[PDB]
């Protein structure tokens, strides 16, 4: 029979950027 | 033999809101 | 033979604070 399953793939990109913060 | 490592993962989450824009 | 893919790496990390607010 085939071998086992292979390792997790890595890790994801970083999130994006929030949005802009409150009005001053 | 294992197969081969795993896809990579999805994007991250969207970061927090920036901090206060300037007075007025 | 080979073993198949392993599975979807992790989620990303979350994203930075976004910018500051705009002026005015």
Same mark, same amino acid.
């Given at each position: =029979?085939?071998? $086992? +399953? !292979? +390792? $997790? *793939? $890595?890790? *994801?990109? @970083?999130? +994006? =950027? !929030? =949005?802009? *913060?409150? @009005? !001053?």
């Amino acid at each position: =029979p085939p071998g $086992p +399953p !292979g +390792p $997790p *793939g $890595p890790k *994801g990109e @970083p999130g +994006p =950027p !929030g =949005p802009p *913060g409150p @009005p !001053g």
